[PDB]
Amino acid sequence: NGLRDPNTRWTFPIPYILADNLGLNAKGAILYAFEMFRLKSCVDFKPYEGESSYIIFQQFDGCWSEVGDQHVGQNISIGQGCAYKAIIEHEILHALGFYHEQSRTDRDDYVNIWWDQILSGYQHNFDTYDDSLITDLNTPYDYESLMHYQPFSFNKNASVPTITAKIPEFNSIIGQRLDFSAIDLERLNRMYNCTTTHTLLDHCTFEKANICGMIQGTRDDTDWAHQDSAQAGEVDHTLLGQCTGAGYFMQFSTSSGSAEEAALLESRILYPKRKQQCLQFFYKMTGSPSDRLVVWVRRDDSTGNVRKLVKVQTFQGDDDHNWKIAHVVLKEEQKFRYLFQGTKGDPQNSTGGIYLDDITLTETPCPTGVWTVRNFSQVLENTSKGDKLQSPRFYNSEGYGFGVTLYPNSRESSGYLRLAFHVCSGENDAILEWPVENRQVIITILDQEPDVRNRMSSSMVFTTSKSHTSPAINDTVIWDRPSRVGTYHTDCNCFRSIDLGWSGFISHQMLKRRSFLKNDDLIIFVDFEDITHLS
Amino acid sequence: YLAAYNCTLRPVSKKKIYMTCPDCPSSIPTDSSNHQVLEAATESLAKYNNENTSKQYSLFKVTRASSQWVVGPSYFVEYLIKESSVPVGLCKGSLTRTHWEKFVSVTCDFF
Numbered sequence: 043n044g045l046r047d048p049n050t051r052w053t054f055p056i057p058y059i060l061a062d063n064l065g066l067n068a069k070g071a072i073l074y075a076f077e078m079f080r081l082k083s084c085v086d087f088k089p090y091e092g093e094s095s096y097i098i099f100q101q102f103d104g105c106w107s108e109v110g111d112q113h114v115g116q117n118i119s120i121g122q123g124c125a126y127k128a129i130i131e132h133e134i135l136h137a138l139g140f141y142h143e144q145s146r147t148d149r150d151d152y153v154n155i156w157w158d159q160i161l162s163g164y165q166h167n168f169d170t171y172d173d174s175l176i177t178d179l180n181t182p183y184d185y186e187s188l189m190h191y192q193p194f195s196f197n198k199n200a201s202v203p204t205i206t207a208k209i210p211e212f213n214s215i216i217g218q219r220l221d222f223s224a225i226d227l228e229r230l231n232r233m234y235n236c237t238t239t240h241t242l243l244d245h246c247t248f249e250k251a252n253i254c255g256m257i258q259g260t261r262d263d264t265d266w267a268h269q270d271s272a273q274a275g276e277v278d279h280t281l282l283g284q285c286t287g288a289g290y291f292m293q294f295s296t297s298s299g300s301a302e303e304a305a306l307l308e309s310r311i312l313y314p315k316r317k318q319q320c321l322q323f324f325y326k327m328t329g330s331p332s333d334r335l336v337v338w339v340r341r342d343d344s345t346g347n348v349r350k351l352v353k354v355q356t357f358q359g360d361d362d363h364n365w366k367i368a369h370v371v372l373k374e375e376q377k378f379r380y381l382f383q384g385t386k387g388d389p390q391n392s393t394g395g396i397y398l399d400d401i402t403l404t405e406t407p408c409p410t411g412v413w414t415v416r417n418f419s420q421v422l423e424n425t426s427k428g429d430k431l432q433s434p435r436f437y438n439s440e441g442y443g444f445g446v447t448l449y450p451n452s453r454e455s456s457g458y459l460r461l462a463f464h465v466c467s468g469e470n471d472a473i474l475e476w477p478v479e480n481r482q483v484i485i486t487i488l489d490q491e492p493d494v495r496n497r498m499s500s501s502m503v504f505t506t507s508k509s510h511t512s513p514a515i516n517d518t519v520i521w522d523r524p525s526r527v528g529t530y531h532t533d534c535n536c537f538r539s540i541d542l543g544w545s546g547f548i549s550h551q552m553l554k555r556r557s558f559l560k561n562d563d564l565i566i567f568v569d570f571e572d573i574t575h576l577s
Numbered sequence: 578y579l580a581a582y583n584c585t586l587r588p589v590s591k592k593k594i595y596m597t598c599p600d601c602p603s604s605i606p607t608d609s610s611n612h613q614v615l616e617a618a619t620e621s622l623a624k625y626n627n628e629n630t631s632k633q634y635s636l637f638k639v640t641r642a643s644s645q646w647v648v649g650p651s652y653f654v655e656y657l658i659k660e661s662s663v664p665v666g667l668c669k670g671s672l673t674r675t676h677w678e679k680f681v682s683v684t685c686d687f688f
């Protein structure tokens with residue numbers, strides 16, 4: 043579906059204007075889409091500085107882009123609701139010379155068009171382009187493509203699909219609005235000769251015996267096993283024992299030896315392109331409560347030699363021995379290596395160890411707060427419609443307390459999950475301004491793939507605003523100080539606001555697919571950050 | 578002095594628009610067979626009447642219309658109004674439904 047003529051290709055960074063007619067929510071959603079491009083491809087963006095062609099993003103009528111680089115510079119529109127990250131990504135893929143997936147030359151081999159069910163005056167939006175206009179990029183037709191239209195698009199009757207997959211399974215899939223598909227990235231990379239993502243700095247799953255070019259220290263006492271996932275309960279996080287002889291994790295036993303013995307696992311040297319990184323990884327701590335998984339940076343001491351240790355975080359055991367996620371904010375502006383010190387404590391009171399798998403290092407802010415809902419499939423059955431879950435209170439960069447309500451069975455939308463952010467009272471509230479307006483919430487259901495190009499994490503975006511009101515609070519702003527707007531909750535010992543976000547955030551039939559659930563663990567990230575500076 | 582004239586006009590070619598920008602709101606006839614365009618103009622008018630407490634307004638006619646389906650059914654419209662006369666101003670507005678969230682927008686200029 044890519045425009046063949048190479049003149050229509052951008053040259054990076056694409057310079058952009060954000061027009062001031064854009065809301066803050068739309069400006070912040072655009073910059074968040076750019077981060078996804080930079081994270082999953084070599085596509086890059088820069089502020090405008092008088093270049094011959096550029097995108098200007100606009101809040102015009104509808105949500106639309108000219109296709110490919112118009113060498114005069116071009117509008118993109120982002121009307122209401124197109125603030126969703128995936129719709130920005132779709133329009134930016136049009137800007138990057140891509141037509142809709144059902145507009146491929148071969149589309150009739152893969153999708154039915156029900157012309158009789160299209161609104162009169164809209165059949166041309168299902169035109170297909172000849173192969174002189176467009177390449178296939180030697181790629182198959184992709185139902186999972188972000189460029190594809192959903193079944194109910196331009197239809198006469200809300201119940202009747204305009205477009206359906208000839209493989210009938212994919213009716214439940216076409217026109218996903220999660221993210222780029224793997225083939226959309228494969229196409230985008232073939233179109234722009236991208237070999238390296240701007241922000242994926244490293245990832246590792248240990249599947250290979252060279253352990254992703256990690257090394258073990260010798261200053262430490264001992265070494266981490268590269269562990270074969272073969273033992274009865276001790277499976278890797280990548281494959282969960284799904285694939286025999288193939289799952290791997292680093293493991294550090296603590297059931298024997300002295301306390302305070304350690305092993306360093308230490309990365310290969312890394313060259314950060316930004317001032318900030320998030321080291322994500324998955325871990326277990328089935329050993330003693332006094333075991334300590336310490337993450338360290340070894341950085342360039344400015345001689346050009348990486349030897350300056352910096353402790354950056356510690357993790358400690360719980361009754362939850364299951365694979366747990368972690369995120370460590372690194373702030374490395376010079377070449378470095380991330381290190382895991384597994385440290386024994388009370389080995390006589392340990393029956394296990396510290397485990398690592400699925401490490402990912404991205405040059406981004408970390409998720410501000412992360413919630414793992416365990417045994418989620420089982421929770422989803424046991425949940426009655428209108429039953430709710432609430433995250434522990436997370437704290438934002440500015441110290442605003444917040445959290446998410448999750449209703450697994452949305453009564454509003456049978457077969458969907460509802461996620462709704464709320465502000466929580468916390469230790470800072472008296473100093474913070476209220477209402478907490480202009481703060482962009484980004485909820486994200488993590489697609490648990492270690493390679494960020496394999497992730498399609500579902501993500502929804504809103505910004506707190508004076509617009510948000512209820513008679514339940516005399517039609518004052520929902521985002522006012524939770525002492526005067528929220529209802530006290532005994533479990534958090536905190537006041538939680540009226541909660542806002544999406545019924546229909548994701549369908550159960552979509553959450554189960556794509557590995558979002560993984561080991562029955564619905565990992566939700568949240569960000570809740572000021573965007574007033576975009577004004 | 579203009580003695581006499583005749584003019585033939587068209588909306589821009591729908592194929593040539595699609596080829597230039599696939600998601601662009603394709604223009605359509607404004608006649609009463611399009612119930613959903615009338616719903617769009619009356620929703621934007623209802624929003625304008627709810628926003629403007631000083632005076633209330635009624636739909637005379639719909640003068641331009643288009644729609645797009647990406648985030649969901651998304652209609653964009655221009656229409657004429659009178660108070661509650663010769664039509665007093667031109668309205669511009671929209672209606673969009675997602676499966677869950679819904680949006681209406683409006684701006685109007687009096688002559």
Ligand SMILES: *[C@@H]1O[C@H](CO[C@@H]2O[C@@H](C)[C@@H](O)[C@@H](O)[C@@H]2O)[C@@H](O[C@@H]2O[C@H](CO)[C@@H](O[C@@H]3O[C@H](CO)[C@@H](O)[C@H](O)[C@@H]3O)[C@H](O)[C@H]2NC(C)=O)[C@H](O)[C@H]1NC(C)=O
Binds near residue numbers: 328360392393
């Ligand atoms: C030995 O370590 C256990 C926990 O570690 C587990 O058991 C060992 C024998 C080894 O098999 C380890 O590999 C394995 O991971 C300690 O028991 C735990 O202690 C904590 C802290 O005292 C208890 O937490 C409290 O729990 C109550 C409710 O039960 C809460 O209200 C408190 O807020 C607090 O969280 C925890 O319950 C307990 N867990 C278990 C499974 O027993 C044990 O105390 C320790 N003993 C010694 C002598 O070091």
Ligand SMILES: *[C@@H]1O[C@H](CO)[C@@H](O[C@@H]2O[C@H](CO)[C@@H](O[C@@H]3O[C@H](CO)[C@@H](O)[C@H](O)[C@H]3NC(C)=O)[C@H](O)[C@H]2NC(C)=O)[C@H](O)[C@H]1NC(C)=O
Binds near residue numbers: 048052233235
């Ligand atoms: C991605 O990589 C492609 C190669 O894999 C690049 O494709 C090459 O781009 C050249 C221009 O930059 C083309 O040169 C032109 O060739 C035609 C004949 O085919 C001549 O008429 C032109 O005069 C000549 N231009 C010049 C300045 O000499 C190459 O033919 C072309 N090769 C192929 C196999 O297509 C892409 O440019 C590159 N794209 C990006 C965005 O990086």
Ligand SMILES: *[C@@H]1O[C@H](CO)[C@@H](O[C@@H]2O[C@H](CO)[C@@H](O)[C@H](O)[C@H]2NC(C)=O)[C@H](O)[C@H]1NC(C)=O
Binds near residue numbers: 201
């Ligand atoms: C939308 O399509 C559905 C399915 O084709 C139509 O539903 C049927 O309507 C008839 C009456 O015309 C009923 O007797 C059937 O029982 C209905 N079937 C179902 C599955 O409910 C529906 O009428 C169409 N609506 C419009 C406005 O076109």
Ligand SMILES: *[C@@H]1O[C@H](CO)[C@@H](O)[C@H](O)[C@H]1NC(C)=O
Binds near residue numbers: 416417420
């Ligand atoms: C998850 O489910 C299994 C059985 O399916 C059960 O043994 C285990 O205790 C559950 N764990 C949690 C944290 O609920």
Ligand SMILES: [Ca+2]
Binds near residue numbers: 306
């Ligand atoms: Ca060692």
Ligand SMILES: [Ca+2]
Binds near residue numbers: 280289
């Ligand atoms: Ca692994």
Ligand SMILES: [Zn+2]
Binds near residue numbers: 132136142599600
């Ligand atoms: Zn499109």
